[PDB]
Symmetry: C2
Subunit: 202 residues, 2 copies
Amino acid sequence: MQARKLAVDGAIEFTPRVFADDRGLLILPYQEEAFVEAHGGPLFRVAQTIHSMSKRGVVRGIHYTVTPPGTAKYVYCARGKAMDIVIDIRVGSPTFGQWDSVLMDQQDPRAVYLPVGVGHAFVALEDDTVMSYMLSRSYVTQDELALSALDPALGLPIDIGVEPIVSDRDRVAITLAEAQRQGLLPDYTTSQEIERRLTAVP
Amino acid sequence: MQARKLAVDGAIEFTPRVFADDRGLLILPYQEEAFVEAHGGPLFRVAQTIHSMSKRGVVRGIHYTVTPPGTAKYVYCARGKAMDIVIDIRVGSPTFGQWDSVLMDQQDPRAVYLPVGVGHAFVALEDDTVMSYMLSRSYVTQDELALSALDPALGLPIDIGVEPIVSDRDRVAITLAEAQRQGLLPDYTTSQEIERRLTAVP
């Protein structure tokens, strides 16, 4: 497994080796040793997993959790192809306002660790695209917020030659800048404090 | 999410609700609230995850970890269709020698919790069948053992109309009864002690 630090502080891209034989294939998308090497502590205790399947051109996001309590996540594409996007919405971060993207396909699988306090989005590049997540806390509707993924200011890589397919909840989301002004974005220091507790060595 | 106790003591089948809209589908395969209600404590800390893809007719198993240290697992089928099998190989268990099966498909997805010390096998019923696992311990070859899935004493449902595709290691694995005589099986009391430690509350 190889790890590569992303441009959003603390986010990490993991590239597992793909093992093949006459029965099929195997990857180990999350590995404690590689994870600790790159992050400095183990994964958060897992509270919930997600399996989402999307049609081509679907854009989901930008999603984040009110912080505190916040949520850290670990995601990979288990079927199909996605452009995964991490957006740094943590006020005070050295990379605040920046985003980075990871192409996730089945030939060269990659997983991404999303720190507490960051935003997540993706676009499905094929039908039947499955995004598989581990989360540090169960989804609580009241704590789950969104930002506009289509915000021309951000210029996310979510246009693939078709009209983006977006839920009304994601479509009506306020922009990063509006959320900042309203005091709705996570604080970087607070997010790192929470993250350090979630990923502490037991 | 609904939980159902399987015939192997401690193994549990979870059935998540499938949410659908014009973008696709979503399930939450692992949910802490439901899991804690059914098992009595939260999932083990996740040491490693697995993404295994198999051709139709592949039979993997029966697999278990030398105990101690043992491995507990949580598994679901993320693509394709599998007959998932849990086999109670724990000497001293009240359900020793029994097995149960869970049909894992994309229409009515089900996940299974496998206690420490049990055996696991499955048959892929479609090509490109993906089995997705969370494990309590990283896979160590020397600690990973096999039992015969074709054992006439068990009568596992693993022949589906094509010649089974089986690794050489699985093909020559000894039977459960023979492994018992040889002293190679997990002990139930030991297994339960490890499981209690892994899944303790706070």
